[PDB]
RNA sequence: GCGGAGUGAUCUACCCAUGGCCAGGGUGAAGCGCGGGUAAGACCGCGUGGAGGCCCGAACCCACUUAGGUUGAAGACUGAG
RNA sequence: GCCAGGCCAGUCCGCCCAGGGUGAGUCGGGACCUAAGGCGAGGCCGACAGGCGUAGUCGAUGGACAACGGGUUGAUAUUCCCGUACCCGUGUGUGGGCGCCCGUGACGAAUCAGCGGUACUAACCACCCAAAACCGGAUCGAUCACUCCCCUUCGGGGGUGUGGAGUUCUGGGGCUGCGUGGGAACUUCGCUGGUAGUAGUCAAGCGAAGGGGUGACGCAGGAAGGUAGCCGUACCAGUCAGUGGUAACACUGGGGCAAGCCGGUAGGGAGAGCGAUAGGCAAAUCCGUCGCUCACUAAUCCUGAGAGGUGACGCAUAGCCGGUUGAGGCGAAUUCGGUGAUCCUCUGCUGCCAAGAAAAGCCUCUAGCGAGCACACACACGGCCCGUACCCCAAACCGACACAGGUGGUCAGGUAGAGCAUACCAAGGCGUACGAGAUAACUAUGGUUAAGGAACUCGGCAAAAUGCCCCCGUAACUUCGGGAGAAGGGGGACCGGAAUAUCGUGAACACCCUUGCGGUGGGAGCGGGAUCCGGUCGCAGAAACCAGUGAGGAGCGACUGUUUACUAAAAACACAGGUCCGUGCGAAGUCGCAAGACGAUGUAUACGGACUGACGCCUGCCCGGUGCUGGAAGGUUAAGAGG
RNA sequence: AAAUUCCUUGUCGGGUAAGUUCCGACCUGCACGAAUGGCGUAACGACUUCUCAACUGUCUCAACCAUAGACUCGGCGAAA
RNA sequence: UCUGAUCGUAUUGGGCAUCUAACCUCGAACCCUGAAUCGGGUUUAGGGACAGUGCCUGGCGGGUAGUUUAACUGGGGCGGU
RNA sequence: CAGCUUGUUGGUGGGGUGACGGCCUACCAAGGCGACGACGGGUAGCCGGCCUGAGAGGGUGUCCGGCCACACUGGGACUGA
RNA sequence: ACUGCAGGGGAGACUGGAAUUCCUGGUGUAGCGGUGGAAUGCGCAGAUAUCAGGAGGAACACCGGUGGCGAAGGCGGGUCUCUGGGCAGUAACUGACGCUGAGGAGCGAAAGCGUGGGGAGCGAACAGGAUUAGAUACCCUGGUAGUCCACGCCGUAAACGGUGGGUACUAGGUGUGGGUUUCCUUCCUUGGGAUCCGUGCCGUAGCUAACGCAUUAAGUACCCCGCCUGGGGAGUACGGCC
RNA sequence: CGGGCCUUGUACACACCGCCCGUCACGUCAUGAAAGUCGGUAACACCCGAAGCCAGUGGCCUAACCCUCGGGAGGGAGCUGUCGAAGGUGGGAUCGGCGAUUGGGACGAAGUCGUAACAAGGUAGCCGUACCGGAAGGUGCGGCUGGAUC
RNA sequence: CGCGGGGUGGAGCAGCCUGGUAGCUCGUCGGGCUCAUAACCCGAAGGUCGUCGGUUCAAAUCCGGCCCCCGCAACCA
């Protein structure tokens, strides 16, 4: 699934790339495409709020359907598996029997041509979308909602899944990819299966220019700055920072979650 | 030098949208064909193909060395590399 | 014009004075469209000042949209004039065509009477249970009343059999009900006659709200087919350049012309009918989706460079006449090849990953409007605002200067050459603003140098050297790609011959045919390249200009990259790779008092921060100190409560 | 004995006619040391450093030629 | 009768649990709306007297700010005073 | 010591020799040798014989006899049966 | 070839329960743990113990053996899917198609290596305690890689029967696994006999230096292959291949 | 503590007051690596190329043969060309010697440190592998009996 | 050179600013245990407290002077 380049140049020695063997129809669906423009990590004030962003190839947004609420009982057929520059997972184009086109995140094992169902009366097969009440415990799911009707938020990256632990009264227990136990309403929805393209994390980008294409600008270590620029700056030779490590704005390392956040009631165990 | 209120990104730093430009040579990746090899394979030899922060080299962009300039042709340049 | 300016002078001038000079339906912009971004009705937020933003409206560097060739002035010309085109709108005629009322064809319901659903379901049936109650068996316990038996301190145990409230298991009736499915009607449904072909609808044209399609998009790489251009050439018109030859093809010049329209080639691209319809907020014959029949190699349609015709009975031109050297008049031939694009077919094709605007415009669908419309020809008209002179790699711009600096795009000839390098030239420009002399030292910029050859110097700094095409040949080491143009060598000019198809490109005259912009053979003329053999010349054949020095051992950084504009380009920064910490989602983090924003139209294989810095082998011990993470037994500790 | 070693031109070997630099070692580490990473490493470098071939006015040791100044004449005509 | 432990009313305080109606929701639908991912209102789905905010109060706080950091001295620094 | 070979392997026409022959040459074809050890490295004149041994074997090549090679080192031809 | 037969032979997918550890909650109070004896350690902030619920990984008690299958290494929770070999019977078919096998290729315990995941228990390294003259150990308390999974590499073991493969022949006795088979066919006995293929013990001839082997040869013979030539140096250096 | 009988293991027989392993220190011998350095051998590519054969040319010389008496034929000297030994240049291959320093090996006396193996050798031992440790070795995983147990 | 720390039994270390009494481990000697040696056990012994010169009734101790040893600094041109 990962193809390795031959060491023809210094910049392709250890590099690797997807084989793109799951991809059909290398062009997108014209009516589901909206424009994007880069922002260079600049907010509404025009200032850099996120460093190390900018440059990179031009992209077009593809409308992914994260609700899957209005087509319960209407079946769909997978037409194409396509490339998507906005996420690590591939996306599937669905032809609903009523004649509507939609993108969903392609699960693992959703070859072109398979049929896909939604609603409480759907089989437990990869690509089906059900309320959590209807999914048996011990099942791998993805694209889970945090609130009923809020859209899929959890387990959308490539290779991700959520393991449904159990349903007690009106709450389901989930083990999320980070490994922490959360509790959600059983009226939330999820798609059955694991997100595909699970091998993409083994890609070795060979050179700096390849990351510039994906839109990351170079990152300067704070220890080779001047004291005016970073708390780690200064020194005659090279140093380790003359103090305990801190952020560029002087914040020390440590937990940054709000201690009295309103969602603590839904967190069973913090990640390890 | 300190404070208050304003002016500046037509220079320069970075970013955003939209256009344009890069003579001529060389090398020969993946893939794909053919033949060999086998039970099938790996693998091998040829073709095709034209990859690459690839090579030599004008425009173009730089500024490493040296000589000249140093009340300059020029408040940072010229010649030769 | 000449007293300032111009680095001298000046009769000249980008200087000074007066007058004149810029002509657009089509060029570049607006009146058309939107991108990043700006402003922003209400709005939200903010003590005030104000911040941000929705609807909206601006905003090209992009999209859409109609003109070419010649002539003319001292100064403008795709603008004026001539010839020939194209685009939008207006009016008036002529002609046929389709419409409404009319009429007219197509479609076409609706009420009330005949059966099942047994759909509905009072009851009923099948099933299990409380199978209620109750009749009543067995199991357990220290109660317990009767009778058989016993000790005593006189109150009860045991032998306790029976039952009593009896625990439990559990036998039968299982009425009454639970539940399911069959399951009475009226009530909902459909069929036939049936209101009746009745009500009603549709059938000119426009539709711009709204739906849909298109518009609509990356980078790299060619090939094939063409054309511009360029070089020859039939043919035409001329020359004798006072030199040894040269009298006509020996030499010189010409050997032309657009948009538009016609045309449909090379090359590309495309299934069509019928039905149904949850979707495209309403609707839809459109789009989407599904199904059937046929075709599926084809036919047909679209598209499309080029060739060809017209444009052109015109314009232009070599030259010749007359010629204040100004304006004028006449004006020949114009065929066939080669080479060849950065241009065109091509918004195509192939490959790749990094996955490559929007809106208008155009087309279509219906909502709707609708009694008059659409069409052909002819004629006559309307085509608005701004720019247009001149410089524009510069003496007219940015540099205080008529300043060796800087300034985006388009075009771009010949011979040699791989080439937009380089040399010399064409078209066309220019000699640019102090000069004239003179063999001083010395400085600068170039050139040559006997013998030696780094002895110079901090240091081979600078210079010298190598350098091209073709052919042999090429090491350690290696991450198997490299190193490598390693190193080191050999050939190179001209003439003749092989050589008349030597070979390879294109392919004229002449050979068939589904007759065409067709095919096959054919090989002319015109160009390309290499070899072998023989000869000739010089000191030298890469000929001038142009054009790698190579090898070896260490250190640092893996590598390409970036940096102190103006003394530091590096061993510094970055980098792919690694590890740790944080973050469960208007997340963490950052900008903001806040709202709001970015993160991200992302979701732990993700994002932020920290350190290390390709790859290989590895990364040992210490938790005492200070941080970080967790905990809460104890000690100390604020306001508040208490008083 | 190091981009780290003061003593110090440590000592031994190699290279040179002669080597405070260079290469290989020794360990007596003033004061190396494992992600402020340790030790290596093919390729790469207008990096630093040492050696060789070729070549040369860098040098022994200079000489000559041409041009722009300098110098002379006419014009204009500053500066610290 | 320290009455230590215990009774029933008060009264209020402290946890603890539940509720919904304040309040919250960048969950959803509809309307203002003709064009609206803003805003507001209506309904619903949740959370919930918590959170957020005001006043008071303790901690932490080179993130930022204002400042201080002696003199003598056979120059100053180090030493000493 | 695992790949060696381009007059190399074969053919045709010529040349050359006392004689066949890539012995030589022009052209044509693409063969030839190799694990039964090609190519390479080490050593060595070979034999009748001699020494040993029950024999088979092992060692050896000196006197004598046969053959080969050479004549200071390398190359070349001439004269001649 | 047909018909039967036995089997932890192999691969994949799903799935079960006991137990250990941890987490949550209840009860509960001062010890637990460990040894030759102790200490380190855990706990009093509520441990060990006990009860209920949950998570997760690994190994599969009884069956179970001396027994089975596989070329060897190896193979046992269950079910399903796919798949290899063996034996017996028949004698239907082919008609010597056989054996061995230099080089070569494939498979090949464990440890180890790479990339990714997982991690209960165990446990190199490491730390503390104890013992000891010392204790880089044995014993104790912890504990990382690893052990597990996917996909590759590695190619070695006292990889052993310390016994290469094929074939024929040479007393028996006695167990056990898989068939077939008359007769005694009920003597129900699933006993006896006969025959074929395994796997053990004991024993004659024969062999052996002896120990022992002995129809499963280390006996009697034939075919092919590998290997040995005193002990060290040394399965090491150099060269090469991976 | 000592003794007796039987049985078991043994690498002991000077008979456990036995045998025996590995570092370290001193000495000797042989050998591997090493910046580099000194020799030998056989080739290869190219440059230059003597003699000589062969092939050409050959105005200079030439008795026999021919002649029309001028010469002709034929020959030679010289010259050119292929091949060509020796030599030169270059990059490799291969066989040895030395080499500061460094790795192990063997043998030495009556040196130092432990006690790994042989008995259940005092923790059964060996095999493969990995990590660790002054050293014999230890520990983990798997294996074997060439060990024990009822 | 400046500054601050040290010198105690054969060796490694306490005791010292507190002036009145020098101790611990290993070592050494003798005795046990052993065939003998280690290891183990028992009993002992051993010191001008770097020198000198001061305060003091009294100094290892307090203070100055020299001697060795160690550590930290010797900087700006
Ligand atoms: Mg702003
Ligand atoms: Mg970042
Ligand atoms: Mg960085
Ligand atoms: Mg810095
Ligand atoms: Mg700054
Ligand atoms: Mg700071
Ligand atoms: Mg710092
Ligand atoms: Mg620093
Ligand atoms: Mg430092
Ligand atoms: Mg660090
Ligand atoms: Mg100011
Ligand atoms: Mg501003
Ligand atoms: Mg190029
Ligand atoms: Mg290929
Ligand atoms: Mg490049
Ligand atoms: Mg270049
Ligand atoms: Mg430029
Ligand atoms: Mg720069
Ligand atoms: Mg200079
Ligand atoms: Mg000067
Ligand atoms: Mg310069
Ligand atoms: Mg330059
Ligand atoms: Mg004047
Ligand atoms: Mg003047
Ligand atoms: Mg307002
Ligand atoms: Mg605004
Ligand atoms: Mg806007
Ligand atoms: Mg506009
Ligand atoms: Mg524009
Ligand atoms: Mg003009
Ligand atoms: Mg006109
Ligand atoms: Mg698009
Ligand atoms: Mg072409
Ligand atoms: Mg003449
Ligand atoms: Mg002509
Ligand atoms: Mg349709
Ligand atoms: Mg035409
Ligand atoms: Mg104009
Ligand atoms: Mg003009
Ligand atoms: Mg202009
Ligand atoms: Mg100017
Ligand atoms: Mg200028
Ligand atoms: Mg040119
Ligand atoms: Mg040029
Ligand atoms: Mg010129
Ligand atoms: Mg003069
Ligand atoms: Mg010279
Ligand atoms: Mg010379
Ligand atoms: Mg030199
Ligand atoms: Mg010198
Ligand atoms: Mg000198
Ligand atoms: Mg130089
Ligand atoms: Mg030069
Ligand atoms: Mg070369
Ligand atoms: Mg090289
Ligand atoms: Mg000559
Ligand atoms: Mg070159
Ligand atoms: Mg080194
Ligand atoms: Mg150095
Ligand atoms: Mg670098
Ligand atoms: Mg490194
Ligand atoms: Mg480069
Ligand atoms: Mg600078
Ligand atoms: Mg540089
Ligand atoms: Mg510089
Ligand atoms: Mg930097
Ligand atoms: Mg936040
Ligand atoms: Mg993490
Ligand atoms: Mg960190
Ligand atoms: Mg770094
Ligand atoms: Mg990084
Ligand atoms: Mg580093
Ligand atoms: Mg570390
Ligand atoms: Mg610590
Ligand atoms: Mg700590
Ligand atoms: Mg701690
Ligand atoms: Mg804390
Ligand atoms: Mg050293
Ligand atoms: Mg150092
Ligand atoms: Mg030195
Ligand atoms: Mg030198
Ligand atoms: Mg030097
Ligand atoms: Mg050195
Ligand atoms: Mg360091
Ligand atoms: Mg570190
Ligand atoms: Mg290093
Ligand atoms: Mg660079
Ligand atoms: Mg550099
Ligand atoms: Mg003068
Ligand atoms: Mg509150
Ligand atoms: Mg509060
Ligand atoms: Mg602070
Ligand atoms: Mg401050
Ligand atoms: Mg102040
Ligand atoms: Mg002072
Ligand atoms: Mg002083
Ligand atoms: Mg030949
Ligand atoms: Mg022949
Ligand atoms: Mg010999
Ligand atoms: Mg014999
Ligand atoms: Mg000879
Ligand atoms: Mg002699
Ligand atoms: Mg000779
Ligand atoms: Mg004779
Ligand atoms: Mg002869
Ligand atoms: Mg498996
Ligand atoms: Mg656990
Ligand atoms: Mg508990
Ligand atoms: Mg418990
Ligand atoms: Mg037969
Ligand atoms: Mg075999
Ligand atoms: Mg074999
Ligand atoms: Mg294998
Ligand atoms: Mg393993
Ligand atoms: Mg592993
Ligand atoms: Mg490891
Ligand atoms: Mg792993
Ligand atoms: Mg354990
Ligand atoms: Mg342990
Ligand atoms: Mg320990
Ligand atoms: Mg073996
Ligand atoms: Mg085994
Ligand atoms: Mg063996
Ligand atoms: Mg056998
Ligand atoms: Mg046998
Ligand atoms: Mg048997
Ligand atoms: Mg024997
Ligand atoms: Mg036996
Ligand atoms: Mg035997
Ligand atoms: Mg070995
Ligand atoms: Mg080796
Ligand atoms: Mg007796
Ligand atoms: Mg014995
Ligand atoms: Mg020795
Ligand atoms: Mg050696
Ligand atoms: Mg000759
Ligand atoms: Mg040596
Ligand atoms: Mg042992
Ligand atoms: Mg022992
Ligand atoms: Mg022991
Ligand atoms: Mg033992
Ligand atoms: Mg250990
Ligand atoms: Mg072991
Ligand atoms: Mg074991
Ligand atoms: Mg300094």
Short mmCIF file of C-alpha atoms (C1' of nucleotides) in Angstrom, two decimals, chain G residues 74 109-112 122-126 133-139 145-146 156-162 232-234 237-238, chain H residues 32-33 104-106 114-116 123 125-146:
data_model
loop_
_atom_site.label_atom_id
_atom_site.label_comp_id
_atom_site.label_asym_id
_atom_site.label_seq_id
_atom_site.Cartn_x
_atom_site.Cartn_y
_atom_site.Cartn_z
"C1'" G G 74 7.01 -29.63 15.76
"C1'" A G 109 13.16 -24.88 18.18
"C1'" A G 110 14.67 -20.79 20.91
"C1'" A G 111 17.28 -16.48 21.26
"C1'" G G 112 18.09 -12.19 18.06
"C1'" C G 122 6.66 -14.15 33.75
"C1'" G G 123 11.24 -11.98 33.27
"C1'" A G 124 17.74 -11.08 30.70
"C1'" A G 125 19.68 -6.05 31.82
"C1'" C G 126 19.01 -2.81 36.07
"C1'" A G 133 36.11 -12.26 53.85
"C1'" G G 134 34.07 -10.36 49.31
"C1'" A G 135 28.93 -11.97 46.38
"C1'" U G 136 29.07 -8.07 39.81
"C1'" A G 137 25.71 -14.90 42.01
"C1'" C G 138 22.48 -18.61 44.23
"C1'" C G 139 17.63 -16.69 48.09
"C1'" A G 145 13.67 -5.44 26.34
"C1'" G G 146 11.54 -9.92 25.33
"C1'" U G 156 21.87 -21.89 14.23
"C1'" A G 157 20.79 -26.22 18.83
"C1'" A G 158 23.05 -32.36 23.11
"C1'" A G 159 18.37 -29.68 15.53
"C1'" C G 160 19.81 -36.83 19.42
"C1'" G G 161 18.07 -42.89 18.20
"C1'" G G 162 24.65 -38.78 19.49
"C1'" G G 232 46.06 -28.39 20.71
"C1'" G G 233 46.45 -23.83 17.71
"C1'" A G 234 40.88 -23.86 15.50
"C1'" A G 237 43.08 -16.12 10.88
"C1'" C G 238 43.31 -14.37 5.65
"C1'" G H 32 46.89 -11.77 12.71
"C1'" A H 33 45.82 -6.25 12.05
"C1'" G H 104 44.89 -13.33 20.39
"C1'" G H 105 48.06 -18.32 20.88
"C1'" A H 106 51.70 -21.65 23.03
"C1'" G H 114 39.33 -16.06 43.18
"C1'" U H 115 37.19 -21.58 43.02
"C1'" A H 116 34.09 -22.55 37.34
"C1'" U H 123 22.91 -23.57 42.57
"C1'" G H 125 25.95 -30.36 33.89
"C1'" C H 126 26.39 -29.46 28.84
"C1'" C H 127 24.27 -27.17 23.70
"C1'" G H 128 22.38 -22.76 20.75
"C1'" U H 129 21.45 -17.64 21.51
"C1'" A H 130 21.19 -12.74 24.09
"C1'" C H 131 22.60 -9.30 27.87
"C1'" C H 132 25.95 -8.53 31.87
"C1'" G H 133 30.33 -9.00 34.88
"C1'" G H 134 38.08 -8.23 37.30
"C1'" A H 135 38.42 -13.55 35.88
"C1'" A H 136 36.98 -18.33 35.93
"C1'" G H 137 31.65 -17.15 34.87
"C1'" G H 138 26.05 -15.40 36.08
"C1'" U H 139 21.15 -14.84 34.42
"C1'" G H 140 16.92 -15.24 30.82
"C1'" C H 141 14.58 -18.53 26.64
"C1'" G H 142 14.41 -23.17 24.28
"C1'" G H 143 16.80 -28.11 24.11
"C1'" C H 144 19.38 -32.92 25.80
"C1'" U H 145 20.63 -36.87 29.70
"C1'" G H 146 26.06 -37.80 28.14
#
